[PDB]
Write a protein that binds this ligand. Structure first.
Ligand SMILES: [Zn+2]
Ligand SMILES: [Zn+2]
Ligand SMILES: [Zn+2]
Lengths: 376, 372
């Protein structure tokens, strides 16, 4: 069984690339892929490093997308082994970035190496889009690489984002899309006054109550074959001066939508306003959208990934759009078809982050199988 | 006169529970005209039971020397603890609530005594240094001491400010009870993108919240308005807008009439929460029961003294907050409250009409003349 993937993963994890620091990870990757005909293009913005590695000049273009940065280790004393010294233990590889997502990068690199050796005259092109800021605000990250590629008409046919997607076993889940995120900051206005003279006041908690119930019980959409129903959740609610004999003058409420393709920004906003207004609520409602939903329908790419996983892992992969989001929300604008595929996301951002040792050669073989099915 | 003795009381920075020898002042000025003094100090608080005479009927003026804070003193046109007569108004903390009322009654006792040294009954003063605060060592313990030796009262006039526009336009003959609740709704914290792995306490509470705000508790009666339910505070969240909170805190209060009971309201709230499947802790606290003095002798003499003195008809009421009468009523056959306009209590630049002081004192006098 191939051990190149594991060795490279350890090498990447050894570098403490906390966001947005890259610690020469992209330099490492460039120099290695240069050995098999990948040309490198640095696209640095601000303090963020990005790189666009590519072998070939013709379509179909297959792209692996990922990030080299990792989230902070947290309390280093709670770690059973140092987060930046990868260790094998109980059939698992422990280290920050072991699951999210340096292992995926290592697996794809070795997949290119084995694939190119078997098919030197493969059709199309293979590319890697690597950023040093995915976990942060990512203003200088993938979004600007995409803008540059879009502007010069360098489009992708198939993209695989190496984010960890597995629930339990490697390959049990593929992401063919994600929800958008629409946050709202609501300030309901009333009129402060002594609690014993309610008629000389307006309790914002009372006025908002009927609207609050309607919002929490609202069915926004029924989802579809790819998405669960659009989800509404209240994160914070705050009103009162601390005094138990005072009616507050205002009430603050912070809520959020994780919405599918069956809903839009405007549709959700107007409905939320209509609910508030028809209950006679007075308020300042301010809005914020951190991401839009994207989707790749079942097709050639999802079928190919599912087939590669069936051959390598021996299990039936399911499609999904649940969870948070990814840089796929930017890349989809230039990628005809895009999926996310990686190891288990159970330990991401947590202490003692890890991945199964046996899952590493498997993931690399899955990537290689996808390349073979698309380019050979 | 009352103007001066008032001004003398307001000059003291007697913020709760500090008395600043206000009770020593009153004990001194009244010992001259037969009032024997008795100090009942408990913990932080200072109380005094001044009394003249030893036979019924016992007329008792109840009040407090302490006052709420002044706030940013850089906002007062004239400093709160240096009285000032401006624009036909006394400016100072305690002017309305309630040192003026205390000054008025003291002088009223002096003038009345000077006219009727041979009056029947007994005049008494129940004064505390903690009414604005938690009042755990205040009037309630003095009443407890009096009740423990059967020293009871026939008429009680609590000098709290009652007037709406002009002095004597309203008097309080009762107050609602106060029942407060501290609710902590339990959920399960989690990332907002995985709602099925969490329980949002704001969502589980929502149906109970609405039903509580819509509930008709009672219809009141000829003396009280309907029982009132209100939320004072609601707080839940960690600050993160991508997190479902693990718990939700809600503080609410009842101002209830005799039409409802403490136990009754508690049970109804629990039933509403339980039938909506809300999981919660709920801490109760009752700072006072409802009480009522029905229209009659003591209210009649008040409207009479006010009609003669002010020239306006006084209406009886039970609205607003509560007073230490919720303790004293247990010992006083008839109890009312009567004082200046409460339009400016607990506020920056507290004040009172200059003309109402001699008037209010004359009313306390008038009431003293008609009972004793
Ligand atoms: Zn990631
Ligand atoms: Zn008072
Ligand atoms: Zn007060």
């Amino acid at each position: 069984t191939e051990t190149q993937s594991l060795e490279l993963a350890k090498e990447l994890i050894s570098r403490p690339s906390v966001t947005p620091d890259d610690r020469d990870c992209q330099k490492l990757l460039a120099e290695r892929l240069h050995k098999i005909g990948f040309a490198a293009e640095e696209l640095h913005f601000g303090d963020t490093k990005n790189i666009w590695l590519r072998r070939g000049t013709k379509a179909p273009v297959v792209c692996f997308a990922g990030h080299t940065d990792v989230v902070p280790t947290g309390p280093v004393e709670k770690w059973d082994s140092p987060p930046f010294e990868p260790a094998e233990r109980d059939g698992r590889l422990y280290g920050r970035g072991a699951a999210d997502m340096k292992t995926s990068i290592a697996c794809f690199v070795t997949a290119c190496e084995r694939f190119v050796a078997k098919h030197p005259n493969h059709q199309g092109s293979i590319a890697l889009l690597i950023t040093s800021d995915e976990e942060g605000d990512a203003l200088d990250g993938t979004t600007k690489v995409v803008d540059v590629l879009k502007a010069r008409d360098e489009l992708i046919d198939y993209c695989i984002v190496g984010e960890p997607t597995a629930v339990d076993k490697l390959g049990d889940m593929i992401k063919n899309g994600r929800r958008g995120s629409l946050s709202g900051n609501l300030t309901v206005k009333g009129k402060q006054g002594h609690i014993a003279y309610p008629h000389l006041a307006i309790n914002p908690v009372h006025t908002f109550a009927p609207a609050l119930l309607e919002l929490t019980q609202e069915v926004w959409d029924e989802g579809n074959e790819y998405f669960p129903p659009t989800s509404f959740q209240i994160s914070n609610i705050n009103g009162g001066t601390g005094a138990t004999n005072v009616i507050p003058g205002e009430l603050n409420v912070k809520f959020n939508f994780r919405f599918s393709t069956e809903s839009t920004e405007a549709g959700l906003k107007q409905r939320v306003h209509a609910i508030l207004d028809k209950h006679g609520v007075q308020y300042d409602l301010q809005w914020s959208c951190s991401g839009q939903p994207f989707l790749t329908q079942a097709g050639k790419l999802t079928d190919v990934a599912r087939a590669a996983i069936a051959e390598t892992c021996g299990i039936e992969a399911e499609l999904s759009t649940t969870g948070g989001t990814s840089d796929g929300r930017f890349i989809k604008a230039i990628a005809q078809e895009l999926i996310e595929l990686g190891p288990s996301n159970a330990t991401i951002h947590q202490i003692n982050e890890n991945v199964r040792l046996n899952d590493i050669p498997k993931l690399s073989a899955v990537y290689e199988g996808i390349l073979a099915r698309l380019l050979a």
